């Protein structure tokens, strides 16, 4: 575990992370995809061998010894708000199980279902709160990655608010 488990936020490409493992915002088919998934495929393409997994689940594949946790959030274009909210909470619970199983002291994690799976809605708070609900019982250092300047400020505020 980390000596004083923390949350932090950085605004940069998650493919450049300084953590012991990465969470991919994956599609259910293990395809290269768009956005975070695209960046992860270019950096760790070996981790896409047999990475397909259903919505609301996470599947870890090693690239060398570096673990890539493929977490499949719902596409809010296809899910109702109710069923999508349940599946988005479930994906983060499965990430916390994998992070614990791997014994890592740190993890890089994007906000699931906030980009092309958002169904055109701002889901920063919804996605971040489900992240916290899952990760708060783990002792890994968590580093959240984002690309927008206003999102960086809002995620940083949400972390600082809890102290």
Which residues contact ligand LF6 (rule: CB under 6 A)? 13-14, 25, 35-36, 39, 110-111, 114-115, 145-147
- Closest-by-Cβ residue to ligand LF6 is 115
Nearer to ligand LF6, 95 or 111 (CB): 111
Binding site annotation covers 27? yes
Query: Burial code of 89-120, b = ≥16 C-beta within 10 A, e = fewer?
Result: bbbbebbbebbeeeebebbbbbbbbbbebbee
Binding site annotation covers 116? yes
Please give the structure tokens belonging to residue 60: 């870890």
Q: Which does 36 bind (CB under 5 to 8 A by kind): ligand LF6, Cl ion, none?
A: ligand LF6
Nearer to ligand LF6, 34 or 83 (CB): 34
Q: Which does 86 bind (CB under 5 to 8 A by kind): Cl ion, ligand LF6, none?
A: none
Nearer to ligand LF6, 30 or 110 (CB): 110
In angstroms, what is the minimal distance from the CB of 1 to Cl ion? 28
Looking at the DSSP bridge assignments, the partners of residue 56 are: none
Q: Which does 151 bind (CB under 5 to 8 A by kind): Cl ion, ligand LF6, none?
A: Cl ion
Residue 37's CB is within 10 A of a number of other CB atoms, namely 20
- Treating both helix axes as pointing N-terminal to C-terminal, what angle do 81-102 and 124-135 enclose, rounded to 10 degrees? 40
d(CA 39, CA 14): 8
Nearer to ligand LF6, 4 or 98 (CB): 98
In angstroms, what is the minimal distance from the CB of 3 to ligand LF6? 26
d(CA 31, CA 41): 9
Yes or no: say if 30 and 52 are a contact pair by the CB < 8 Å rule: yes
Binding site annotation covers 24? no
In DSSP notation, 129-161 reads: HHHHHHHTT--SEEEEEE--HHHHHHHHHHHHH
Q: Which residues are annotated as a binding site for ADP-D-ribose?
A: 13, 27, 35, 115-117
Binding-site ranges for Cl ion (CB under 5 A):
12-13, 115, 117, 146-148, 151
């Amino acid at each position: 575990g980390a000596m004083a488990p923390s949350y932090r936020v950085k605004r940069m490409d998650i493919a450049k992370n300084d953590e012991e493992c990465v969470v991919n915002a994956a599609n259910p088919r293990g395809l290269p995809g768009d956005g975070v998934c695209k960046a992860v495929y270019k950096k760790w393409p070996e981790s896409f061998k047999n990475s397909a997994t259903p919505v609301g689940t996470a599947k870890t594949v090693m690239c060398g010894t570096y673990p890539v946790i493929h977490a499949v959030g719902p596409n809010f274009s296809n899910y109702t708000e109710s069923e999508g909210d349940r599946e988005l909470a479930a994906a983060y619970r499965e990430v916390a199980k994998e992070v614990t199983r791997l014994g890592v002291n740190s993890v890089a994690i994007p906000l699931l279902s906030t980009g092309v799976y958002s169904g055109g809605k701002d889901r920063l708070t919804q996605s971040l709160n489900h992240l916290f609900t899952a990760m708060d019982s783990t002792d890994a250092d968590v580093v959240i990655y984002c690309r927008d300047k206003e999102w960086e400020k809002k995620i940083s505020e949400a972390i600082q608010m809890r102290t």
